[PDB]
Design a protein around this ligand. Structure first.
Ligand SMILES: CC1=C(/C=C/C(C)=C/C=C/C(C)=C/CO)C(C)(C)CCC1
Ligand SMILES: CC1=C(/C=C/C(C)=C/C=C/C(C)=C/CO)C(C)(C)CCC1
Lengths: 114, 171, 113, 124, 118, 180
């Protein structure tokens, strides 16, 4: 398996459970296209987004639904959502790992390329 | 004031005080405490350990509101009244700690009165405590109780120094 | 100097000087339309973007070209650019400063209203 | 059968990442300490990070008693062998533990020559 | 101007006002001995911590109280305090800016000033 | 400079170029570039794709020397000479791009040129570039080849400058020596 998506809470120090995630791929026409969807599990993770064969090159944009995660907490954020735009299998199939540590007013995104 | 010598509940009896209790008043300790819909479930395990699981809403972080689920273990000491509590939110970020946890009075079935000063003013019995007014039924207490919970708040020190807690479905 | 954007290198523990920044204001048609732009100065800040009365409540987005910034540095980055979405509510306080901490594979942002 | 027996679900777990190469920090030193009864830091658990950037088995349930502990990660070494003069001599995390009952802690540290951040994933 | 520390509250996305800050400088004997201290103003910044000829080469540790801050909000935190140890070398640049970003279970930190001297 | 004014190897045969090539003189194209201890390795592969995978030492990030391990694929064209190589680092953080990669001459047996302009002058023809001067033995070319590799740097708008392409048993692995 290739892509993965981890999300964690920076206020309850606990994974970020049931967090919708939407992936898109820049199309031939500079237009984003739906490529994958899903929601974090009880372990902050979101498996089986894509297959290697399917996973081709191009810019991909992971869009994390933070704003309703935060709101459903009973807290109002400052961010609408988190975005992570990068290029993939640009020089040969790799296995990506996207992590995200969420705060109401400040988050961050790392990327482990294997 | 004078925290010690406040002669607390007598031949206390853990078990008999193992029902359910509801809030009714409150002393404002310094800092961020519970808020409303303050209920507590007193248990007990063979061993003799008198536990007690509270339920309540507190003004956490500026706005945000959370109905915080709390827990608390009690460790004996002379008087059968007194106790040593080490509470903790089943969930993190929830003020963990230790506090005095006497039991000033209580017929077990109706009213009770819990006091707890955790710092003492310059050698000199207490300087800032929090007290709860508990009662079996969430409606109020007969004329008798009230006339005692009233003639304690004087002993225990506080008279009127409270502020009844509502309980609008929230937790 | 409201809506002051800042940037920091974590790798050269220094200010991200010359970091192109473009802001966008979500239009009626749910489309992003340029709002203001520039580059971070020698100290890593970029103020003079807007004005109290141009800056109304709504949804803008702050775009951080970071690859062009690692690209000068001989480092080929993971990210394509560091985007930023949030809504501007008069709600109360209106002094916005969205910082950014840049590294070739991770980046973090925060605000102070 | 033996006395003192239980499960083997790593209570503690350190994890280091590389902000510059986008890889897990491998072969990083991590020394652990527990405040003593006399305000003295005592050595607790030593170890280096795997190919994973993960250090497993640094302690046991029974052996992890409540108190304060420390987790020092010598970033200074990592960066130098590489060819980079860092700013921080090392990264320090000081926290209490199993304060209100035993709990599973996971300390992750993202590394950057002049910056580093730490977080804790813990759950009841 | 000597070492301007600055805090930031990530939950509140504001400035960590009134945060205590004690700084130490390793002594001969390998011990820390108080160097300066104070509290973060209304902006969340700490200035007036020392001077050009008192701030000498060596190893410094910065200690920031986050716990306090947090319990003052009412949230229980992870840490016991955040620490920052670093070599103050006459090396080149000497303008140091020490920042922190605090949330209940995590905090990051960066430093600045480069070596403008070919 | 300018472009299309000069040549490139005739029916150059990739299969008879294949072998190791030792840098000896470069060019200073704008922005960081490959340091010293620059050694090729040009492979093919049934289909015909002419690969290559040159190592080197780079000035990366201020004062952090790293012996970079590249790799670059090539895509044909019309004149067997010029190709279309997209280069990337076996490892991230390694400036990956696509540059035009001719072959301004050679004799696949010690001493082959190379060119590449990725910016053209006010429609004049050629702004920036970069160039390398190869030979198969790291000790220098005969009096003939260096005769030509000195003729072709005046026919090659901007062929050989020759910065200190310094070979010095550098990217060892058995004792790090300097890197990873
Ligand atoms: C354990 C416990 C006691 C106190 C609980 C407290 C003092 C909870 C405080 C929660 C804090 C304020 C949460 C902060 O987020 C009471 C007396 C009800 C009796 C039995 C249960
Ligand atoms: C791929 C490649 C070419 C150029 C590689 C370059 C231009 C590498 C640049 C490396 C960068 C500078 C590293 C930055 O860290 C040469 C012409 C040797 C021929 C075959 C291999």
């Amino acid at each position: 398996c290739p892509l993965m998506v981890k999300v964690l809470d920076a206020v309850r120090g606990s994974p970020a459970i049931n967090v919708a995630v939407h992936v898109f791929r820049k199309a031939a026409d500079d237009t984003w296209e739906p490529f994958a969807s899903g929601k974090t599990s009880e372990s902050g993770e979101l498996h089986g987004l894509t297959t290697e064969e399917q996973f081709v090159e191009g810019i991909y944009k992971v869009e994390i639904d933070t704003k309703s995660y935060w709101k459903a907490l009973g807290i109002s954020p400052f961010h609408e959502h988190a975005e992570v735009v990068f290029t993939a299998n640009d020089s040969g199939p790799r296995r990506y790992t996207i992590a995200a540590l969420l705060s109401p007013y400040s988050y961050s995104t790392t990327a482990v390329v294997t | 004031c004078a925290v010690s010598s406040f002669r607390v509940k007598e031949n206390f009896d853990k078990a008999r005080f193992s029902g359910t209790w509801y809030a009714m008043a409150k002393k404002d300790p310094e800092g961020l405490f519970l808020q409303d819909n303050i209920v507590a479930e007193f248990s007990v395990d063979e061993t003799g350990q008198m536990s007690a699981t509270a339920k309540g809403r507190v003004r956490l972080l500026n706005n945000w509101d959370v109905c915080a689920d709390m827990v608390g273990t009690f460790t004996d000491t002379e008087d059968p009244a007194k106790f040593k509590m080490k509470y903790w939110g089943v969930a993190s970020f929830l003020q963990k700690g230790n506090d005095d946890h006497w039991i000033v009075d209580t017929d077990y079935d109706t009213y009770a009165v819990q006091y707890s000063c955790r710092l003492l003013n310059l050698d000199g019995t207490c300087a800032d405590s929090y007290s709860f007014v508990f009662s079996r039924d969430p409606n109020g207490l007969p004329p008798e109780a009230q006339k005692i919970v009233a003639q304690r708040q004087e002993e225990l020190c506080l008279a009127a120094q409270y502020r009844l807690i509502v309980h609008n479905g929230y937790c």
